[PDB]
Design a protein around this ligand. Structure first.
Ligand SMILES: Nc1ncnc2c1ncn2[C@@H]1O[C@H](COP(=O)(O)OP(=O)(O)NP(=O)(O)O)[C@@H](O)[C@H]1O
Length: 874
């Protein structure tokens, strides 16, 4: 009866809305869309909202409203998103929109006494665990980019956060259009006992047009009404009938320029190729003198902080070169400050051509007039594969600027060969991506909750999305089993069914080895099952292993077993005949008879001769005899089958009962398997390695691990627990620690480790990790590919860089010896600061003040220059 999540009908309207709101906490130059009105309304009622709105609709408006309320009730509104890189920006967007707002990061903290705070989800979780005091004064928590999914991002923890939030906190979840919003809104509302209204939109306010660029021509293939244009696509194919060349970009750039479809963002899934393509625009310029000067001034003003040695970095000079001509690239290889320059200049209208990797499309709020896909295929750790509809929608959706563009232009590049239609339709018009739960158990979480209170973990698991999902399913499967249990209420089968499965198995097995084409030579009379599973007989005519389908000349369906005379007589009487037809049949054929027909093609023509022959043969085959049958896998399979072997109008019921048993048995397991198993395993793991004792008390070791929130808490704890690091220099320690924050995917050969101790340290960590893996294996706990291949990658490749950096080398010299691009160097080194902080705290717990001192020293050594430059957004 009681519902906590309420779906707001799209057909619903608020004509008297302007009257319902007496004193709107905020107003805008424009007129709010119905969904925004819904949002504001339900917010003012004192309820929660889950807004899943198309790209270009204006979700931020709901965020600003909320905030406003916080400034009207002396309450606090915390804004959160999983994307840390986008904290500084959002913090600047609100400052320029509203007026005290703060910013909470790991090291930097600005204006905490504000009625609004910007922070990542992790920081919020952290504050929750901490039990911060300001949370008692928080009324609204905004969860932005709820649809954000990233496997390599450990900060997507809004579920844990929502579970942990106190009862007096109301929610505002912002998301792209997803199909399963109600699920999560219902979990939230039910689990939190909160009225939450699910709000969405019918379509994109700024409609997209999807085009293909082929042979210097722009061809529409999906119109504003999302209709696929077959003729045009075929046209592209025909025109063409294989990647960017030197003339590619100048040509399309020039084409779009004459037609004023700029600025353009070109998505390129490769940093190198971004830069290459950008370089291919040599001699093209979009900036007049004043613009060049403004840009120069902005850059000069922005980097004046840095030392001269950093201002003159090659990447900076090259970037300036591009920027002063209205061109840029955007990718993870760039120094943050450079990224920021590019972003700020792009948002202000100084950049007309931007080549960007996928990241640019996710967080950043920088829409463009035109979006181009250099390719709709991207390589992920798995390899090369087509983009998913969600990704394509995410990138393509950037192409419409509400208020500036009538429409958003999206272009897919074709080069020398046509794009496949299935691929293209799957990528551009595939089923929209669903919200998935990101909630996982970690040792850190378990140790912390366990340290807090005995059954906190169980409680956390009870209130998770998975559990609630299981709860939602339970009754459904109950009714299904009720119908089945009642439906039924109103050895032969085992061996037989097994025999069927065995024959199917063997058949599937024979479909791999070409040798089959010898057994299924044109004319091989066989008894097979049609789609309706009716036994029939026919001669083989074609064998396409590529499609694994055989064309047969067919005996009407019979609505046996090799060498089963009596069994045949009793079970299988004479079959019926029917005009021969060519039927396509799947290999997975109940029996391959010894009978072979001497050309069918002549029977297909109905030549009197072949006709008579066929008639006689068929009549003969259908008249008398009973069917006779006739690698290493097929051998064993056949053996087992024969073992089972040695082992008409009445089998219907039994068969039905079997079907039932299968269904029910199936619906049973469907309620068996999920966090509790993992949890038990993890407890076992923590018990074996002594983070907790036999009674599940958290030991000192576990209290140390509680402080490491970076991913490899157990191994790191193990590393720092004793005094192996006793004779290491701060530089050496921070150098060695880089292994826990570097993917180690460099495609270059590792040079000699710069010091002996570092080599020893690598050895030590490797050993620790091996042991830990052994323990993971013992308790059959599933590993992520990273955990698994950890040692198979070059994770230690950054030790030298970090060492030399801690020694005082300039970034220039650092880069001259780095196996990774600037951005990654900065990523590693900036993460190491946090690592050092964690280790400091840990050392406090351990009582090792020397280690503490060293870590402080390391922080002091690495925390400098362009690597730690203040954000341009602040
Ligand atoms: N009701 C409105 N009428 C006219 N303009 C609006 C309206 N609402 C928002 N805008 C403007 O259009 C833009 C809205 O974009 P935004 O706030 O980021 O939502 P969004 O497009 O859905 N973000 P995202 O989906 O992640 O890409 C802002 O620049 C607003 O100024």
């Amino acid at each position: 009866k009681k519902e906590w999540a309420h779906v707001v009908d799209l057909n619903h309207k608020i004509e008297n809305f302007d009257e319902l709101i007496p004193n709107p906490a905020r107003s805008w130059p424009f007129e709010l869309d119905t969904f925004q009105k819904e949002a504001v309304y339900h917010l003012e009622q004192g309820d929660s909202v889950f807004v899943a709105a198309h790209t270009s609709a204006g979700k931020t408006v709901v965020a600003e409203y909320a905030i406003a309320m916080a400034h009207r009730n002396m309450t606090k509104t915390i804004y959160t998103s999983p994307i840390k890189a986008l904290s500084n920006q959002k913090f600047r967007d609100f400052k320029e929109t509203f007026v005290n707002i703060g910013l909470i990061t790991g090291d930097v903290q600005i204006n905490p006494d504000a009625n609004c705070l910007i922070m990542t989800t992790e920081i919020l979780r952290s504050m929750l665990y901490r039990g911060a005091d300001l949370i008692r004064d928080v009324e609204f928590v905004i969860f932005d980019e709820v649809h954000y999914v990233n496997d390599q991002d450990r900060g997507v923890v809004w579920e844990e956060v929502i579970i942990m939030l106190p009862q007096h906190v109301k929610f505002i979840l912002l998301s792209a259009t997803v199909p399963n919003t109600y699920e999560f809104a219902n979990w939230i509302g039910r689990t939190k006992q909160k009225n939450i209204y699910v709000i969405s939109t019918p379509k994109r306010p700024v409609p997209l047009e999807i085009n293909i660029w082929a042979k210097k021509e722009l061809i529409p293939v999906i119109n504003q009404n999302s209709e696929f244009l077959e003729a045009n696509f075929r046209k592209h194919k025909e025109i063409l009938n294989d990647g960017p060349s030197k003339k590619t970009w100048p040509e399309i750039v020039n084409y779009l320029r004459k037609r004023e479809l700029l600025p353009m963002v070109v998505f390129v899934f490769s940093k190198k190729r971004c830069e290459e393509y950008a370089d291919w625009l040599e001699g093209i310029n979009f900036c007049n003198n004043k613009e060049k000067s403004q840009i120069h001034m902005f850059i000069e003003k922005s980097i004046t902080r840095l030392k001269k040695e950093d201002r003159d970095l090659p990447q900076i000079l090259k970037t300036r070169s591009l920027l002063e001509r209205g061109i840029a690239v955007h990718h993870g290889g760039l120094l943050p400050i450079v990224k920021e320059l590019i972003e700020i200049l792009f948002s202000k209208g100084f950049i007309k051509v931007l080549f960007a990797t996928e990241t640019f499309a996710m967080g950043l709020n920088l829409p463009t007039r035109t979006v181009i896909f250099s390719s709709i295929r991207k390589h992920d750790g798995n390899g090369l594969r087509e983009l998913t509809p969600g990704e394509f929608t995410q990138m393509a959706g950037r192409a419409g600027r509400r208020g500036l563009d009538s429409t958003g232009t999206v272009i897919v590049m074709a080069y020398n060969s046509p794009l496949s239609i299935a691929t293209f339709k799957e990528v551009t018009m595939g089923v929209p991506t669903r919200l998935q739960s990101q909630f996982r158990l970690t040792y850190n979480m378990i140790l912390n909750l366990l340290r807090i209170e005995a059954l906190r973990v169980e409680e956390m698991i009870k209130y998770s999305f998975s559990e609630n999902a299981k709860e939602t399913l339970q009754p459904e499967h109950e009714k299904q089993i009720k119908v089945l249990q009642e439906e039924l209420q109103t050895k032969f089968l085992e061996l037989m069914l097994a025999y069927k499965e065995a024959t199917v198995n063997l058949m599937q097995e024979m479909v791999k080895s070409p040798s089959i084409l010898h057994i299924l030579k044109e004319g091989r009379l066989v008894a097979f099952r049609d789609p309706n599973d009716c036994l029939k007989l026919g001669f083989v005519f074609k064998v396409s292993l590529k499609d694994a389908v055989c064309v047969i000349m067919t005996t009407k369906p019979y609505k046996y077993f090799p060498k089963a005379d009596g069994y045949r007589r009793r079970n299988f009487p004479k079959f019926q005949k029917t005009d021969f037809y060519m039927e396509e049949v799947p290999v997975t054929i109940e029996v391959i008879t010894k009978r072979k027909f001497a050309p069918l093609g002549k029977v297909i023509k109905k030549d009197v001769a072949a006709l008579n022959e066929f008639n006689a043969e068929t009549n003969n085959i259908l008249d008398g005899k009973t069917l006779k049958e006739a690698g290493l896998k097929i051998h064993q399979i056949l053996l087992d089958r024969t073992n089972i072997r040695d082992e008409s109008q009445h089998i219907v019921p039994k068969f039905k009962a079997h079907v039932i048993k299968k269904k029910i048995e199936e619906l049973y397991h469907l309620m068996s398997d999920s966090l509790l198993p993992d949890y038990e395993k993890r407890l076992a793991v923590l018990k074996d390695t002594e983070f907790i004792d036999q009674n599940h008390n958290v030991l000192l070791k576990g209290r140390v691990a509680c402080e490491i929130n970076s991913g490899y808490e157990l191994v790191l704890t193990e590393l720092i627990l004793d005094n192996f690091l006793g004779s290491f220099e701060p530089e050496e320690i921070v150098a060695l620690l880089s292994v826990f924050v570097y993917e180690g995917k460099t495609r270059e050969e590792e040079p000699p480790i710069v010091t002996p101790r570092l080599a020893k340290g690598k050895q030590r960590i490797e050993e620790i990790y091996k042991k830990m893996l052994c323990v993971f294996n013992t308790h059959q706990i599933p590993l992520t590919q990273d955990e698994a291949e950890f040692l198979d990658r070059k994770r230690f490749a950054m030790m030298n860089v970090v060492y030399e950096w801690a020694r005082g080398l300039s970034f220039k010299e650092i880069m001259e010896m780095s196996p990774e691009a600037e951005g990654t160097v900065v990523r590693v080194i900036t993460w190491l600061d946090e690592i050092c902080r964690e280790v400091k705290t840990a050392s406090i717990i351990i009582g090792n003040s020397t280690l503490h001192m060293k870590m402080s020293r390391a922080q002091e050594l690495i925390k400098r220059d362009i690597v730690f430059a203040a954000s341009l957004y602040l």
